[PDB]
Design a protein around this nucleic acid. Structure first.
Ligand code: D4T
Ligand code: MG
Ligand code: MG
Lengths: 412, 555
DNA sequence: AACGGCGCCCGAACAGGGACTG
DNA sequence: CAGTCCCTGTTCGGGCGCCG
């Protein structure tokens, strides 16, 4: 009884044609059970080989959840319909969400299964369930309703979502609600008891209309930044000062007032690296001035809503991971550090996966965008293991880099 | 008026703005003429082919080749121009079934659908785009032109349509017999069950009659009721499997195309024969781009070929997968970037073997390559069995711990254990984390002219030691590496080296033990001889330390 | 002389970053 | 500041094996 909102690809782009990757046994058995129920409910339908489009599919378990969740890698289809969920029917991002004391993330993707999808667009939601040892050919489906993980789903459902959230927003004018992908970000300044109580009221508000019982809690007011810090030693060697001048020189690309004149004068000659060099009166002054500049904010650094977010990550060792979010080089909008995450001191890929998810969650709260990541890992290493540790219902873009640490810039 | 088959048709369109094929026939021998006129007449009576007239302005040439191990001929259509104008299909065949992934079944039956493509219909609105003439005489009768009502052999949409149609027909039968495994690859059907031999044939005949409802015939010619079953090019026995006999050519004079076939069969043989190498054989296929050019076998390529033939002498076999037991994968280093592995569940009962010998990167080490081998085995195991095997690796836990904790890139190996089988994988040198007290400090640098290709490399030290070496036909990057090589040559067992070269430092910090660069290999050899090496980096052209002094010498 | 699938080892074409030169 | 170079990386298409 709902007219299908017409959806069109961006001009000059065809549908996604991404190959399905191998899946573990437990994931295939989970997807077969999930897709059989969805097909019985009419949410998906089997298709043939005349649909040349395809999108990868796998399954995940959210944090502290034992239930499988179907996850579709709609990253290719999303950027081929970008003029829809950003130009035609966009969702405004509230600047106050990051200022709230507590923010709960609710999975509302199951509500999208009630709205039908445009018949002319269902062919672009095709996916293929693989088989172990290639016992059978691929089992292909397509979506009949709004699919989870597609950026067009919250855009079309936004009209329905507003009417559902309208009585609750009038009841609580101080609560900030933001919708991104399959998630609903609910932020308030109430106490932990009052907040979780109001979250349950919103849950009951949605029930009167399978992961709604979960509630991942955030505290953006407690989010910290990791500035550039300089070492403080009682004695300085030639090697110490050579590392300091190298670090300050690279930092000059961000802070133009940093000077290294008086510090480079200490290294006049051809000295041994372990020779202790006492700091002169001018060197103490120049080093103290550079410490204040590193505390000052960078000039002309603000968010441009028309530019993509870029996230770089560095592996610092011993469970330490630093990161910077920026749109222009040396114009970091945020720098931070993670430590002692899951997999610390045993699994680099699990930690890197966790860091990517944390950074993306912060970017959704602060700017409403997911950044494109520059991952310090080999492509084959990441593509072998990352799905084993992914616990989010969205997937950011990423590329793979290899930058040896010539100087520890973000973590001494 | 042709009857519509029970199989649901697949709607096939074409690329917009394009029409159908209009290609002239190919003059063939009179032998092929008397082997296609009889086919188009039989298929016309069976409803598989209808005759057309002048209202079909299309044409496509056809040819025929003898079937392997059969008196019957095979008809193929050269639809290469039709494929360029036909819509793209997504292939539902995601891989090739491997016998090591098969589980133990009490009874096994291998079927084979007769006239596979000729039993699945074509789209109604698409039959008009398949026109072709058949001359009964090479230059007399013009020959009445026919069309296709089924799937032609040679069309790029025929495999995907058949594989998808076969699945929809088997879906109701598999729902009625859940405990029966049916490996469906193209037309061949592997049917296995734990039922008794008597009860197994009963369900086989139920399946044979089930497929017959859609016009799919399973003749007794290719019906396999007893081992050894020939399935996917293997010999399947009740408790073991093996590859069909692999014959390697033995020529007195070897050319390029002969080695390509030789290396190919050794790759196919390495799935069950442990220890096969094709490094020195494939090395002969470099540079030369003439498939009909004789290439003499090098002494390394000859010994490699001799060792592979002796491996193929003794008959080897693989076993089947038992889900109740764990998966074990063990790797050995074969040297020269060559790795071999075995996957098994019981000791010395290999499910399958394999090799990893890919050389990625100009500079690397055995630890990086072992990591890449583990990743290849993991993905291979997820395809075949859907799970990661426990690894037995020839690297100490302490060695692996030192590497991944100190590497700047994320790297990981799944659950594994150390196996003490030499040659062990180790790191051949360790760069110090702090400068070495009492070790001479070398400030190295190198510069080269872009035009004349001339350059200099050298160093200055805190003790006054100095060197400048002129170099010809070099680059800025080479002189920086050369400067470090000089500092290693002229220093004691412990040395601190200061460079401004991000290029050279990035190579050495990754602790390579092998390189395509002779200069890097010489540097690696020096690094191994040292007891303590500390590499430090400073920005160039900043008047920092002795780096400013050595910069004047080499520039 | 046809089609589709997977694997390997190969080379040519292309991309991207430090670094030098106009 | 551009425009190159040197170097190293990925992508892809073809060679071969093998299946149907
Ligand atoms: C071997 C082969 C096969 N095919 C396609 C056609 C039918 C299926 C199966 O081929 P087949 O089993 O050997 O022959 P088929 O048509 O089934 O006829 P029968 O020999 O089984 O009676 O794959 C092909 O197009 N080209 C080929 O070279
Ligand atoms: Mg057959
Ligand atoms: Mg230099």
């Amino acid at each position: 009884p709902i007219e299908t909102v017409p959806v069109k690809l961006k001009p000059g782009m065809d549908g996604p044609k991404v190959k399905q990757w191998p899946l573990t046994e437990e994931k295939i058995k989970a997807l077969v059970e999930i897709c059989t129920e969805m097909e019985k409910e009419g949410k998906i339908s089997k298709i043939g080989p005349e649909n040349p489009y395809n999108t990868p599919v796998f399954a995940i378990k959210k944090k502290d959840s034992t239930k499988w969740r179907k996850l579709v890698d709609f990253r290719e289809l999303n950027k081929r319909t970008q003029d829809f969920w950003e130009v035609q029917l966009g969702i405004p991002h509230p600047a106050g969400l990051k200022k709230k004391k507590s923010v709960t993330v609710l999975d509302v993707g199951d509500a999208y299964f009630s709205v039908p999808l445009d018949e002319d667009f269902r062919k672009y939601t095709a996916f293929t369930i693989p088989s172990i040892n290639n016992e059978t050919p691929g089992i292909r489906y397509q979506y009949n309703v709004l699919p989870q993980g597609w950026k067009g789903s919250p855009a079309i459902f936004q009209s329905s979502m507003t009417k559902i959230l309208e009585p609750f927003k009038k009841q609580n004018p101080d609560i900030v609600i933001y919708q991104y992908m399959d998630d609903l970000y609910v932020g308030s300044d109430l106490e932990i008891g009052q907040h979780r109580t109001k979250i349950e009221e919103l849950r009951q508000h949605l029930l009167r209309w399978p992961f709604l019982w979960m509630g991942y809690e955030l505290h953006p007011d407690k989010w910290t930044v990791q500035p550039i810090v300089l070492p403080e030693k009682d004695s300085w060697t030639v090697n110490d000062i050579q590392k300091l001048v190298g670090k300050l020189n690279w930092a000059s690309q961000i802070y133009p007032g940093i000077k290294v004149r008086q510090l480079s004068k200490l290294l006049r000659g051809t000295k041994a690296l372990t020779e202790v060099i006492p700091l002169t009166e001018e060197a103490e002054l120049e080093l103290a001035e550079n410490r204040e500049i590193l505390k000052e904010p960078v000039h002309g650094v603000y968010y441009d809503p028309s530019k993509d977010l870029i996230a770089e990550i560095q592996k610092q060792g011993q469970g330490q991971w630093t990161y910077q979010i920026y749109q222009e080089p040396f114009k970091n909008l945020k720098t931070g550090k993670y430590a002692r995450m899951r997999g610390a001191h045993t699994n680099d890929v699990k930690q890197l996966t966790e860091a990517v998810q944390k950074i993306t969650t912060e970017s959704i709260v602060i700017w409403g965008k997911t950044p494109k990541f520059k991952l310090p890992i080999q492509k084959e290493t990441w593509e072998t293991w990352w799905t084993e540790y992914w616990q989010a219902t969205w997937i950011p873009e990423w590329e793979f880099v290899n930058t040896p640490p010539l100087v520890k810039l973000w973590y001494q | 008026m042709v009857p519509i088959s029970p199989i649901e048709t697949v709607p096939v369109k074409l690329k917009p703005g394009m029409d159908g094929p209009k290609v002239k026939q190919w003059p063939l021998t009179e032998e092929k003429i008397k082997a296609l006129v009889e086919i188009c007449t039989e298929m016309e009576k069976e409803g598989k082919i209808s005759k057309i007239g002048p209202e079909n302005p299309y044409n496509t040439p056809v040819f025929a080749c003898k079937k392997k191990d059969s008196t019957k001929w095979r008809k193929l259509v050269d639809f290469r121009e039709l494929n360029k104008r036909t819509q793209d299909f997504w292939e539902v065949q995601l891989g090739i079934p491997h016998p090591a992934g098969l589980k133990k079944k009490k009874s096994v039956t291998v079927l084979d659908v007769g006239d596979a493509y000729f039993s699945v219909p074509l789209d109604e609105d698409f039959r008009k785009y398949t026109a072709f003439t058949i001359p009964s005489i090479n230059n007399e009768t013009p020959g009445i032109r026919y069309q296709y009502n089924v799937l032609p052999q040679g069309w790029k949409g025929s495999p995907a349509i058949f594989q998808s149609s076969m699945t929809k027909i088997l879906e109701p039968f598999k729902k009625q017999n859940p405990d029966i495994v049916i490996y469906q690859y193209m037309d061949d059907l592997y049917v296995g069950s734990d039922l008794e031999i008597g009860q197994h044939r009963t369900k086989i005949e139920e399946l044979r009659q089930h497929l017959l409802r859609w016009g799919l015939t399973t003749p007794d010619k290719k019906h396999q009721k007893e081992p050894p079953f020939l399935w996917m090019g293997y010999e399947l026995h009740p408790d073991k499997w093996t590859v069909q006999p692999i014959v390697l050519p033995e020529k007195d004079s070897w050319t390029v195309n002969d080695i390509q076939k030789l290396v190919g069969k050794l790759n196919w043989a390495s799935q069950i024969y442990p220890g096969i190498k094709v490094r020195q054989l494939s090395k002969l296929l470099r540079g030369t781009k003439a498939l009909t050019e004789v290439i003499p076998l090098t002494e390394e390529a000859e010994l490699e070929l001799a060792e592979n033939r002796e491996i193929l002498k003794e008959p080897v076999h693989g076993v089947y997968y038992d889900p109740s037991k764990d998966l074990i994968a063990e790797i050995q280093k074969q040297g020269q970037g060559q790795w071999t592995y075995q996957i098994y569940q019981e000791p010395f009962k290999n499910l399958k073997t394999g090799k990893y010998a890919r050389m990625r990167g100009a500079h690397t080490n055995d630890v990086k390559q072992l990591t890449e081998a583990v990743q290849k085995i993991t993905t291979e195991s997820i395809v075949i069995w859907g799970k990661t095997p426990k690894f037995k690796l020839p690297i100490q836990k302490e060695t692996w711990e030192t590497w991944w904790t100190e590497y700047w890139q994320a790297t990981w190996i799944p659950e594994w254990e150390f196996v003490n089988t030499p040659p062990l994988v180790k790191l051949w040198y360790q760069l110090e984390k702090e400068p070495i007290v009492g070790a001479e400090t070398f400030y190295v640098d190198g510069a080269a002219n872009r035009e004349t290709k001339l350059g200099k490399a050298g160093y200055v030290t805190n003790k006054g030691r100095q060197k400048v070496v002129p170099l010809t036909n070099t680059t800025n990057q080479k002189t920086e590496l050369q400067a470090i090589y000089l500092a290693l040559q002229d220093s004691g067992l412990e040395v601190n080296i200061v460079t401004d070269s991000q290029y050279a430092l990035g190579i050495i910090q990754a602790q390579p033990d092998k390189s395509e660069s002779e200069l890097v290999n010489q540097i690696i050899e020096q690094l191994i001889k040292k007891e303590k090496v500390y590499l430090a980096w400073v920005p160039a052209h900043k008047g920092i330390g002795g780096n400013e002094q050595v910069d004047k010498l080499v520039s």
